[PDB]
Amino acid sequence: GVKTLRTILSSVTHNGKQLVMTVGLLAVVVYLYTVVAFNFFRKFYNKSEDEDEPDMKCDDMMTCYLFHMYVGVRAGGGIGDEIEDPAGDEYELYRVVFDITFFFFVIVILLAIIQGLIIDAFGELRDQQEQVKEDMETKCFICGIGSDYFDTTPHGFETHTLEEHNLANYMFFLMYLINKDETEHTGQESYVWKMYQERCWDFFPAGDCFRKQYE
Protein backbone atom coordinates (compact mmCIF):
# COMPACT_ATOMS: atom_id res chain seq x y z
CA GLY A 1 0.00 0.00 0.00
CA VAL A 2 0.61 1.46 -2.35
CA LYS A 3 3.33 1.69 -4.96
CA THR A 4 5.09 4.26 -2.91
CA LEU A 5 5.81 1.66 -0.26
CA ARG A 6 6.15 -1.14 -2.66
CA THR A 7 9.06 0.89 -3.99
CA ILE A 8 10.75 0.60 -0.84
CA LEU A 9 10.78 -3.20 -0.61
CA SER A 10 11.71 -3.24 -4.17
CA SER A 11 14.68 -1.06 -3.23
CA VAL A 12 15.80 -3.48 -0.75
CA THR A 13 16.49 -6.29 -3.02
CA HIS A 14 16.07 -5.67 -6.75
CA ASN A 15 19.78 -5.23 -6.41
CA GLY A 16 20.23 -7.24 -3.28
CA LYS A 17 22.44 -9.86 -4.88
CA GLN A 18 25.07 -7.14 -4.48
CA LEU A 19 24.28 -7.07 -0.96
CA VAL A 20 25.71 -10.49 -0.39
CA MET A 21 29.13 -9.17 0.10
CA THR A 22 28.36 -6.56 2.53
CA VAL A 23 27.58 -8.43 5.72
CA GLY A 24 30.33 -10.78 4.54
CA LEU A 25 32.62 -7.98 3.95
CA LEU A 26 31.79 -6.91 7.35
CA ALA A 27 32.33 -10.33 8.78
CA VAL A 28 35.67 -10.14 7.26
CA VAL A 29 36.40 -7.11 9.03
CA VAL A 30 35.33 -8.45 12.18
CA TYR A 31 36.97 -11.85 11.93
CA LEU A 32 39.95 -9.93 11.18
CA TYR A 33 40.26 -7.61 13.99
CA THR A 34 39.02 -9.67 16.63
CA VAL A 35 41.56 -12.40 16.46
CA VAL A 36 44.42 -10.07 16.72
CA ALA A 37 42.38 -8.52 19.38
CA PHE A 38 42.20 -11.89 21.03
CA ASN A 39 45.89 -12.02 20.80
CA PHE A 40 47.54 -8.66 21.22
CA PHE A 41 44.67 -6.81 22.88
CA ARG A 42 42.55 -8.74 25.28
CA LYS A 43 43.38 -6.55 28.01
CA PHE A 44 41.44 -3.63 26.83
CA TYR A 45 38.05 -5.15 26.52
CA ASN A 46 36.71 -4.95 30.00
CA LYS A 47 33.33 -3.84 30.82
CA SER A 48 33.62 -4.51 34.48
CA GLU A 49 31.82 -2.35 36.94
CA ASP A 50 34.78 0.08 36.77
CA GLU A 51 36.46 -1.23 39.90
CA ASP A 52 38.73 -4.39 39.68
CA GLU A 53 36.25 -7.20 39.66
CA PRO A 54 36.20 -10.09 37.22
CA ASP A 55 34.36 -9.45 33.83
CA MET A 56 33.03 -10.38 30.47
CA LYS A 57 35.69 -9.07 28.20
CA CYS A 58 36.44 -11.35 25.24
CA ASP A 59 36.35 -14.61 27.23
CA ASP A 60 35.53 -16.66 24.15
CA MET A 61 36.19 -16.22 20.54
CA MET A 62 32.59 -16.20 19.71
CA THR A 63 31.95 -13.68 22.32
CA CYS A 64 34.53 -11.19 21.43
CA TYR A 65 33.22 -11.46 17.92
CA LEU A 66 29.68 -11.01 18.93
CA PHE A 67 30.78 -8.14 21.05
CA HIS A 68 32.06 -6.30 18.09
CA MET A 69 29.30 -7.85 16.09
CA TYR A 70 26.94 -6.08 18.61
CA VAL A 71 28.87 -3.05 19.29
CA GLY A 72 31.45 -2.64 16.66
CA VAL A 73 29.09 -3.50 13.92
CA ARG A 74 27.03 -0.67 15.21
CA ALA A 75 29.92 1.31 16.44
CA GLY A 76 28.81 4.84 15.71
CA GLY A 77 31.01 6.18 18.43
CA GLY A 78 33.18 3.18 17.51
CA ILE A 79 34.90 0.45 19.56
CA GLY A 80 37.07 3.10 20.85
CA ASP A 81 34.07 4.46 22.68
CA GLU A 82 34.01 1.25 24.82
CA ILE A 83 37.46 -0.24 24.63
CA GLU A 84 39.36 0.33 27.88
CA ASP A 85 41.94 3.03 27.12
CA PRO A 86 44.54 4.93 27.31
CA ALA A 87 46.51 2.58 27.39
CA GLY A 88 48.82 4.40 27.62
CA ASP A 89 50.91 1.11 27.11
CA GLU A 90 52.39 -1.59 24.91
CA TYR A 91 51.37 -1.74 21.36
CA GLU A 92 49.34 1.49 21.85
CA LEU A 93 50.61 2.95 18.60
CA TYR A 94 49.12 -0.06 16.85
CA ARG A 95 45.80 -0.20 18.69
CA VAL A 96 45.01 3.24 17.86
CA VAL A 97 45.67 2.52 14.27
CA PHE A 98 43.80 -0.65 15.06
CA ASP A 99 41.07 1.64 16.12
CA ILE A 100 41.64 3.54 12.95
CA THR A 101 41.65 0.48 10.74
CA PHE A 102 38.42 -0.12 12.55
CA PHE A 103 37.39 3.31 11.54
CA PHE A 104 38.20 4.31 8.07
CA PHE A 105 37.58 0.80 6.97
CA VAL A 106 34.36 0.43 8.71
CA ILE A 107 32.83 3.55 9.82
CA VAL A 108 33.06 4.87 6.38
CA ILE A 109 34.10 2.38 3.82
CA LEU A 110 31.85 -0.37 4.94
CA LEU A 111 28.75 1.30 6.00
CA ALA A 112 28.44 3.76 3.26
CA ILE A 113 28.45 1.22 0.48
CA ILE A 114 26.06 -0.62 2.34
CA GLN A 115 23.93 2.45 2.25
CA GLY A 116 24.50 3.41 -1.24
CA LEU A 117 23.88 -0.01 -2.43
CA ILE A 118 20.33 0.91 -1.71
CA ILE A 119 20.02 4.51 -2.18
CA ASP A 120 20.67 4.68 -5.93
CA ALA A 121 18.68 1.59 -6.07
CA PHE A 122 15.77 3.50 -4.64
CA GLY A 123 16.50 6.07 -7.18
CA GLU A 124 16.63 3.59 -9.89
CA LEU A 125 13.28 2.17 -10.24
CA ARG A 126 11.85 5.46 -9.10
CA ASP A 127 13.61 7.26 -11.92
CA GLN A 128 12.01 4.75 -14.20
CA GLN A 129 8.64 5.90 -12.96
CA GLU A 130 8.85 9.27 -14.52
CA GLN A 131 10.84 7.58 -17.26
CA VAL A 132 7.66 5.65 -17.97
CA LYS A 133 5.75 8.84 -18.15
CA GLU A 134 8.64 10.38 -20.06
CA ASP A 135 8.94 7.62 -22.58
CA MET A 136 5.13 7.63 -23.13
CA GLU A 137 5.35 11.33 -23.69
CA THR A 138 8.60 11.09 -25.83
CA LYS A 139 9.15 8.12 -27.85
CA CYS A 140 5.83 6.74 -29.14
CA PHE A 141 4.91 3.69 -27.17
CA ILE A 142 3.63 2.21 -30.27
CA CYS A 143 5.52 3.36 -33.42
CA GLY A 144 8.42 4.60 -31.55
CA ILE A 145 9.93 7.30 -33.61
CA GLY A 146 9.71 9.91 -30.77
CA SER A 147 7.20 12.70 -29.90
CA ASP A 148 9.37 15.06 -31.58
CA TYR A 149 8.45 14.45 -35.08
CA PHE A 150 4.63 14.66 -34.08
CA ASP A 151 4.95 17.61 -31.94
CA THR A 152 5.46 19.42 -35.33
CA THR A 153 1.78 19.86 -35.37
CA PRO A 154 0.81 21.63 -32.16
CA HIS A 155 -0.24 19.50 -29.21
CA GLY A 156 0.08 16.78 -31.85
CA PHE A 157 1.78 13.84 -30.61
CA GLU A 158 -1.30 13.06 -28.25
CA THR A 159 -3.22 12.88 -31.45
CA HIS A 160 -0.50 10.53 -32.75
CA THR A 161 -1.05 8.54 -29.59
CA LEU A 162 -4.52 9.01 -27.99
CA GLU A 163 -6.31 9.66 -31.22
CA GLU A 164 -4.08 7.62 -33.65
CA HIS A 165 -2.16 4.79 -32.09
CA ASN A 166 -3.99 5.10 -28.85
CA LEU A 167 -2.37 1.82 -27.95
CA ALA A 168 -5.60 0.84 -26.07
CA ASN A 169 -7.43 0.48 -29.27
CA TYR A 170 -5.48 -2.54 -30.18
CA MET A 171 -6.96 -4.50 -27.55
CA PHE A 172 -10.48 -3.67 -28.39
CA PHE A 173 -9.51 -4.69 -31.86
CA LEU A 174 -8.96 -8.13 -30.87
CA MET A 175 -12.32 -8.65 -29.32
CA TYR A 176 -13.62 -6.94 -32.42
CA LEU A 177 -11.96 -9.68 -34.22
CA ILE A 178 -13.12 -12.38 -32.02
CA ASN A 179 -16.73 -11.46 -31.94
CA LYS A 180 -16.88 -11.37 -35.70
CA ASP A 181 -17.31 -14.46 -37.75
CA GLU A 182 -14.69 -15.31 -40.21
CA THR A 183 -17.17 -14.75 -43.06
CA GLU A 184 -17.49 -11.13 -42.41
CA HIS A 185 -13.80 -10.50 -41.75
CA THR A 186 -12.37 -7.85 -44.02
CA GLY A 187 -9.35 -9.09 -45.92
CA GLN A 188 -7.10 -6.60 -44.17
CA GLU A 189 -8.10 -7.89 -40.84
CA SER A 190 -8.14 -11.29 -41.73
CA TYR A 191 -4.38 -11.75 -42.33
CA VAL A 192 -3.96 -9.76 -39.35
CA TRP A 193 -6.23 -12.31 -37.69
CA LYS A 194 -3.96 -14.81 -39.20
CA MET A 195 -1.05 -13.04 -37.98
CA TYR A 196 -2.68 -13.44 -34.60
CA GLN A 197 -2.87 -17.06 -35.38
CA GLU A 198 0.82 -16.97 -36.15
CA ARG A 199 1.87 -14.45 -33.59
CA CYS A 200 4.84 -12.79 -35.31
CA TRP A 201 3.11 -9.58 -34.51
CA ASP A 202 5.09 -7.81 -37.14
CA PHE A 203 2.23 -5.83 -38.42
CA PHE A 204 2.80 -3.40 -35.66
CA PRO A 205 4.71 -0.52 -37.15
CA ALA A 206 8.47 -0.68 -37.60
CA GLY A 207 7.98 2.91 -36.78
CA ASP A 208 7.11 4.58 -40.02
CA CYS A 209 3.69 6.16 -39.49
CA PHE A 210 1.07 6.90 -42.16
CA ARG A 211 1.21 10.63 -42.51
CA LYS A 212 4.93 10.43 -41.85
CA GLN A 213 5.30 8.08 -44.70
CA TYR A 214 3.62 10.47 -47.17
CA GLU A 215 2.33 14.03 -47.26
Partner 1 sequence: NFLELAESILEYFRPYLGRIEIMGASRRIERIYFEISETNRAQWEMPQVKESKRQFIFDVVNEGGEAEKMELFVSFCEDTIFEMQIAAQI
- Residues of the shown chain interacting with partner 1 in the complex, contacts defined by CB under 8 A: 125, 128-129, 131-132, 135-136, 141-143, 151, 154-156, 163-166, 168-176, 178-179, 188-189, 191-192, 195, 199, 201-206, 208-210, 213
State phi, psi for 74 to the nearest 5 degrees.
Answer: -80, -45
Q: Please say whether the beta carbons of 78 and 103 come within 8 A.
A: yes
Q: Give the contacts of 86 (CB within 8 A, at least 6 positions apart).
A: 92
Q: Does 137 count as an annotated binding residue? A: yes
If the CB atoms of residues 80 and 205 are measured against partner 1, the closer one turns out to be 205
Q: Is 137 one of the binding residues for a copy of itself (CB under 8 A)?
A: no
Say how far apart CA 121 and CA 214 lie, in whole Å: 45
Q: Is 125 one of the binding residues for a copy of itself (CB under 8 A)?
A: no
Taking CB within 5 to 8 Å according to partner kind, which of a copy of itself, Zn ion, partner 1, none is near residue 188? partner 1
Among 11, 44, 142, 157, binds Zn ion (CB under 5 A): 142
Q: How many residues bind Zn ion (CB under 5 A)?
A: 4
Q: How many residues does the chain have?
A: 215
Say how far apart CA 195 and CA 212 lie, in whole Å: 25
- The H or E element spanning position 164 is none
Q: Which long-range contacts (CB under 8 A, 24 or more apart) does 32-39 make?
A: 33/68, 33/72, 33/98, 33/101, 33/102, 34/61, 34/64, 34/65, 34/68, 35/61, 36/98, 37/64, 37/98, 38/64
Q: Is 16 one of the binding residues for a copy of itself (CB under 8 A)?
A: no
Contact residues: a copy of itself, CB under 8 A: 4-5, 8, 11-12, 18, 20-21, 24-25, 28, 31-32, 35, 38-39, 56, 59-62, 65-66, 69-71, 73-74, 76-78, 80, 86, 88, 96, 99-100, 103-104, 107-109, 111-116, 118-120, 122-123, 152, 154, 202, 206
Q: List interacting residues with Zn ion (CB under 5 A).
A: 140, 142-143, 165
